[PDB]
Design a protein around this ligand. Structure first.
Ligand SMILES: COc1ccc(N(C(=O)Oc2c(C)cccc2C)c2ccnc(Nc3cc(OC)c(OCCCN4CCN(C)CC4)c(OC)c3)n2)c(OC)c1
Length: 273
């Protein structure tokens, strides 16, 4: 189990926090931009009581206590006496999917998009090496800093893997366009499932946040994939990159490359441009 709150180094008195601006509001709670001890800017997630189990809520906080890296949004603190809060490192420019649509994002050069792509792969390489999987890898869950660097966020579905794979529930449902076939079909996820999602994420980067598989419904996406087709070349997408995306979408999970490999290639692509 976890150390008791009176011993957990992560526990902080609720008095230390002040919620300032609401970033998101959902069925299970809200997320706010706030301040820790006045001067430190942070993000605070609050649990809407009754919406879900506190155990269920704090589970991702506990995983984040275990998974730490410069490229992953860092757990800052936790308040475990109701109401419950999960506090994290703050990212000024929000989600990558949103940032890419702003005046600043629209002007990003392909070189910078490749840089960011490599930054993301760098973080996944760490997750990969530590025997974890994300399962929710998408531009929506990549946050951007004030210095235009990227970090992986939302470890809600993230899981420590005991021996290569994790099996989800038969009732658990996932985003069709972002999830690997084997995961949608048998609920089985592996780091290779994340590699597939990364491919999809790449299309999000080069299209400045467009929804993958343009003009296609989910039934259509699934049917086309089974025929051997893959997403159509996005407008204005370097061919080298399109081909890297294809590696991420190979039929056999084992045939897809590692995240470290993806990182190296993207870094070469970046240094070139
Ligand atoms: C669902 O919203 C989300 C809200 C917050 C977070 N989140 C986080 O880590 O949440 C979290 C915590 C704290 C603990 C456990 C698990 C999770 C997910 C988080 C953590 C650190 N920085 C930021 N900055 C941010 C600044 C910003 O702005 C400064 C912004 O934009 C908000 C406004 C965007 N909207 C876009 C559409 N329209 C223009 C209205 C504004 C952002 O939006 C993405 C984000 N967000 C999400 O991370 C996935 C999604």
């Amino acid at each position: 189990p976890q150390k008791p709150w009176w011993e957990d180094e992560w526990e902080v008195p609720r008095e230390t926090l002040k919620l300032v601006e609401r970033l998101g509001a959902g069925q299970f709670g809200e997320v706010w931009m706030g301040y820790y001890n006045g001067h430190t800017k942070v993000a605070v997630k609050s649990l809407k009581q009754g919406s879900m189990s506190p155990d269920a809520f704090l589970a991702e906080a506990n995983l984040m206590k275990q998974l730490q890296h410069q490229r992953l949004v860092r757990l800052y603190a936790v308040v475990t006496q109701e109401p419950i809060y999960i506090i994290t490192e703050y990212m000024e420019n929000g989600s990558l999917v949103d940032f890419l649509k702003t005046p600043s994002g629209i002007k990003l050069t392909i070189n910078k998009l490749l840089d960011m792509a490599a930054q993301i792969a760098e973080g996944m390489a760490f997750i990969e090496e530590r025997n974890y999987i994300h399962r929710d890898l998408r531009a929506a869950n990549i946050l951007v800093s004030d210095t235009l660097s990227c970090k992986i966020a939302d470890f809600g579905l993230a899981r420590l893997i005991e021996d290569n794979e994790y099996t989800a529930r038969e009732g658990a449902k996932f985003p069709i366009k972002w999830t690997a076939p084997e995961a949608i079909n048998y609920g089985t996820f592996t780091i290779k499932s994340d590699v597939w999602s990364f491919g999809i994420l790449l299309t999000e980067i080069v299209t400045h946040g467009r929804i993958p598989y343009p003009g296609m419904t989910n039934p259509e996406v699934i049917q086309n994939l089974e025929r051997g087709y893959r997403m159509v070349r996005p407008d204005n997408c370097p061919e080298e990159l399109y081909q890297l995306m294809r590696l991420c979408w190979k039929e056999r999970p084992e045939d897809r490359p590692t995240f470290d490999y993806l990182r190296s290639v993207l870094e070469d692509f970046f240094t070139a441009t």
